[PDB]
Amino acid sequence: QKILQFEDILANTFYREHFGMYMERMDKRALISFWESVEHLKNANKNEIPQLVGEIYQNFFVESKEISVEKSLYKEIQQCLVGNKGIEVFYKIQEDVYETLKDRYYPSFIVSDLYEKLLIKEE
């Protein structure tokens, strides 16, 4: 009956892993992995926060482009991502990635063969 809400899809490890498998089919699993990394940051102890923020950059923002802003301005990027500013930036990107996952990818996941596995067959 009632459609699972995308908020609950990402809150439940069993649901979210199935949605991640669907994103892998689209070769866009880095979108949900980045969302999961920022969310893990929101619920992490502060002794791990700066190293996690650094691993987020090293896992999702180090794609080497031909016009290499990442290499030419490495120090300059890190300094404008230093403290609460960097955490606030990663939060805003997570918010934008969330809307893209919700509006562009979640509707086709509901009609995929994976949404069935999230439904309880009543006995």
Residue numbers in the entry: 447 to 569
From the publication, what sentences describe this entry?
One of the most highly conserved sub-families are the SNX proteins with regulator of G-protein signalling (RGS) domains or SNX-RGS proteins. Other well-characterised family members include Mdm1 from Saccharomyces cerevisiae and Snazarus (Snz) from Drosophila melanogaster. These proteins have relatively low sequence similarity across homologues and across species but share a conserved architecture with an N-terminal hydrophobic membrane anchor, and a central RGS domain and PX domain (except for SNX19 orthologues which lack the RGS domain). The N-terminal membrane anchor mediates localisation to the endoplasmic reticulum (ER), and the proteins typically localise to sites of new lipid droplet synthesis and can enhance membrane tethering of the ER to other membrane compartments via their PX domains including the vacuole in yeast, the plasma membrane in Drosophila and endolysosomal compartments in mammalian cells. The precise function of the SNX-RGS proteins is still unclear although their mutation or depletion has significant impacts on cellular physiology, particularly with respect to lipid homeostasis and endolysosomal function.
The wildtype sequence of the RGS domain crystallises with a non-native disulfide bond formed by Cys526 between adjacent monomers in the crystal lattice which distorts the orientation of the helix α5. Here we have solved the crystal structure of the human SNX25 RGS domain, revealing a typical α-helical RGS fold. The structure predicted by AlphaFold2 is remarkably close to the SNX25 crystal structure, with an overall root-mean-squared-deviation (RMSD) of 0.8 Å over 107 Cα atoms. The predicted structures of the human SNX13 and SNX14 RGS domains from the AlphaFold2 database are generally similar to the experimental SNX25 RGS domain structure as expected, but with some notable differences. Overall, these comparisons confirm that the AlphaFold2 predictions of selected SNX-RGS domains are accurate models comparable to their known experimental structures, including the RGS domain of SNX25 for which no detailed structural information was available prior to this study.
